[model samples]
Target: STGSATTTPIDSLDDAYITPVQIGTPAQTLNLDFDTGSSDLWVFSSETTASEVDGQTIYTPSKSTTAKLLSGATWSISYGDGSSSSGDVYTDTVSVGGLTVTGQAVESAKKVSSSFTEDSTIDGLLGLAFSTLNTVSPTQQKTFFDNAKASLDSPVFTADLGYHAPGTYNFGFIDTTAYTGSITYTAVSTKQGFWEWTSTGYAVGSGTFKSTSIDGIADTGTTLLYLPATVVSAYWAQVSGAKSSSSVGGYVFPCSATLPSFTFGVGSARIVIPGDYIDFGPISTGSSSCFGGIQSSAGIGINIFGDVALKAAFVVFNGATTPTLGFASK
Candidate 1:
């Protein structure tokens, strides 16, 4: 009742890593960004207008024998970066890795923003968060995991995201060979459809771990780590030539500036993100400034532990019990 799959980066250290999925009767395979933020398995489809479509591979449900349209059902989603897509719904067979789920709801896009149409490599997205966050109106949909859970022996999955390296998403069972040492468990309170948990406190650099509690979502779709304004300011303040640059829209510093490792507390586990990882590449085309991976989630309401923070550790999205979070050193 266990299955696993390998996922690779689009480019080295890109915003999101992608995996392959097979859809329909004859089977159409596409590369999809596996997102943990939202709960809708959306894709570019034959229904998308030619003008609104780009180099993305499209799923033509009409070509599938198992495709069945849910009349009047539709879905639309706007991402954190202003990207949006909307389309009709179809119930079809979906195969992830070696595991197959029958009658999975696949949202086929008829309208998509430029942000999505321009991404030539990604064909769609696979939502890994709770099904309650699904955007399908009238009748909310269930995620691939939820539909396949009854067949899974453990009802668990582990995300092994690497830095500029290939990673794997394992399902149903835990692979002990993936990591070293023991994985510490923290009670996760997930009511808002996110894999959210509270941090005991944080340290900017070599500073001590403060006992302030910060609630954050362990999101894969988000590229950078987001935290409170106060915490973000403190971390950037410790680095030389670092300043709150409104021009860059966040904290920016010289590419040569050295950053310190960031630490966060989760019960007894102290998760540490290396300083090098804190530098979220260069900012723009003609700029010497670079954006800090750890930015302010001030207005975002919830702090997001994106790839920047979570990539430093092996994360287990536990569906059993109260849906606890398991973290271990990679």
Candidate 2:
């Protein structure tokens, strides 16, 4: 059963980062990255060097109004993309959507790479996907959820992906208004963070990929859905006079044409990728053509369900209990 505890948007501070949440009587301010790819809340600290903390938001312990560092201990994290970061461990009052959690574990990145440094607006990514993707190995460190679970009114968290812009992702308790009352949840597979699944098949209009099946992961970290070469060709076949162009990275059809919608079956869930998502924006080289969602990944891994799929449904990461991805009503 859902609770009556309501939520509101956290005030944006600099148009880049949201204002730190006020937690407890001391009024500690902690920066947070509300991400849907993984579930965890961490922040930077003062001890971090200027070089290491470059291109990231550093939380001032003194300015926090209430903040504390954990006993001297180093922490590090590595992502599936091979990106990594290392820093010191600290504890401080952290809050999200008015909900406060005291002594929340955080990482103050003392060293980061140029790729991470390039994104001046993004300080740190908050993992809102699942607990299984946690950087803190249960044996090594306690996760933020493990510590704050007791403080939550319902011991559950849901993401409101509808309110924010295309790139903007928000987190907090689930908004019932966003759903149609019926929640279709897919049980988390035996795998850890990767929501691995076999794409039984795909179809564009009445056309189908009869030769092969697409195996991929539904990743929020990814920005677009990547399909196999054969599958991509089959999709383009249905588009009227659609041609494979290197400029758009994949097969791009006329933006004004009646683009057929594609659908995929993940277990029991039938997800439809709309044609508009494919026609994202006007092409860079070909002014007459528009860039579609299906991009090239000649060297990249298998298909990835990025933000394109997310826009179609409400994704629920059930890390509080079992690991599962729940699809909210259309």
Candidate 3:
């Protein structure tokens, strides 16, 4: 039977974000994001001005005795959406699930924009995705997992978003007994920074597109699926009685029919997306139309398959032992 979608509301704190786990001997509370695209733990500092920030949680070092600043090192990150943030580096004891990891590197953004400062619920992001994309150096940084590995009853970590509130998410060791059976894993491919793979083809309702194969990358941080222009146009053509309306962007389809499914061959494993994903509407503009799922990225080289596709399965990122990725029924 097909698994039904589960919705979990992430929690929200006041101005500061807190994880249930404590870091260091005294257990200092830090804000974090469960970021999948990148692996890093960053926090905001009290020194940050309120006016310059937007939707992020800022941390105050003076509030915690264990907080330690790295002094001269700097850090910055730019998102694909043209958003960016920069700050100084700091070293502090951090903990997750009550396991203390010493000397965890954190970024303290000094000058932040409203995009990051105003969002009180989204203070900081804790990257639980993989270690290969870790911004911290291997010698200087030890992630929450690296420290918990030794003491954790199981070598695995599972993100249970079933209980997540709108603004807050939690992390902890997976309770093996809670699951029904043995965990299945997929081997990771080391082709590029992002998880990239080739698709066999795309299908809608009962019709399959056989003329061309699609190449794309899977990213957890992103919110939607971005397909190539040619592939997008070809897909819309196949939807039974599908019509484009100027509503959300460009191609709005009224067809309630199952769009189609897509399968991608990853070595011996295959990843599939149900036909329901093709039911998207168009965003209306003056004279142009843009589809909700399809947008223009004129020069971007890689295609991104975001969380919309990943939420359908349980993804296991095995970056610690091997460059492997596994997906199973959630």
Candidate 4:
């Protein structure tokens, strides 16, 4: 069996991308972030405290005839920002696009942080990373992709993100027409519970490609591209007014500055990120200085290739017994 879904960027391209998910019997539709960086299909629901709820849609298991409580099951997950959510578990029929999974673990939030309540665009996250990273205590659960993999034709899924336009997520098969040029495959290191891999190196606009081994994960859950400070500095130096601002934070530059494109290596393939993508919008509402889309991964422990880099190519999270990642220019 195969399935496909449309992923839309919320508010702006710089924000998170969300896809529609149908939970339970009658289908409570919610816009969920398909987060490749984490593992746990969690959502805001009836169980969540009222004070934590905002304008976002909530999933109510009580209304679904097929919903069954996963007695004694509980979960909790925290983010880099210190924000978090914790909840009990339920098993129910869930569907993404046209792919349906029976008895899927649906974590219903009992408590959520204020940051999540304020951001009404996201209902929750549908984690696509390895099941080993699942936050459920006592008994870890499989992700939506893991349970659906056996039924899928090829045991794989692909992400095709866009700059401002709607993108697509396809399961079971690779859409040949979705990408340009042949794909470059790389072995994934899942020991860290992420889709982590080593990139050959990178280059500033029109500069020579540097031969360095940079390790990072392809994280759809994150908004920006994060690399080593040395790599980030090299790219920003090409921009006339770029600086590592203390007040503005990270790297910022005049909105009028001419930014240069960035290139990274995958096998022998060179993926070039357009200069416009690097100019991450203004620091403030009416500010003339724009924050950079690419930043230093200094204290973060590991680098992350997020939406900014994903937007430039087609990415495949291949779930075969021996997992691997595939990248193709589009």
Best by lDDT: 4
Residue 126 error, candidate 3, Å: 2.1
Model 3: how large is the Cα RMSD against the reference? 6.5
lDDT of 2 at 73: 64
Report the candidate with higher TM-score, 1 versus 4.
4
Candidate 4 local lDDT, 1-330, one digit each (tens): 998999999866457898999999899999999999999999999989999999989999999999999989999999765779999999999898899999999999999999899989999999999999999987999999999999999999999988877899999999999999999999999999999998999999999999899999999998899999999999989888899988876999899988889999998888899998777788989999899999999979999999999889999999999999999999
What is the C-alpha lDDT profile of model 3 across 214-330, one tens digit per residue? Answer: 566656566556677666666667655555444444455543444556543443444455655433333333422323444333346767666545544455555445545555444
lDDT, candidate 3, at 198: 54
lDDT of each: 0.87, 0.55, 0.51, 0.92
lDDT of 1 by residue, 1-330 (tens): 776877787875557788999999999998999888889999889999899878888999999999999888999999888899998999999988888899999999999999888778889999999999899987999998888888888988888888878788888988888877889888787798999988888987789888898998989888899999999988988988999877778888898888899998877778888898887667876778888888999878889999888888888999985798888887
User: Which portions of model 3 miss their true places by more than 4 Å?
Assistant: 1-31, 54-56, 129-143, 146-156, 159-184, 195-201, 209-216, 238-291, 294-299
Identify the runs in model 2 with alpha carbons over 4 angstroms from their true place. Answer: 1-33, 38-57, 78-83, 129-133, 136-139, 150-156, 163-174, 195-201, 205-216, 239-259, 266-269, 280-291, 295-303
How close is every model to the real structure, measured as TM-score?
0.96, 0.71, 0.69, 0.98
Cα misplacement distance, residue 205 of candidate 4 (Å) = 1.0
* Candidate 2 positional error at 254, Å: 6.4
Error of 4 at 207 (Å): 1.1
Best by TM-score: 4
lDDT of 2: 0.55
RMSD of 4: 0.9
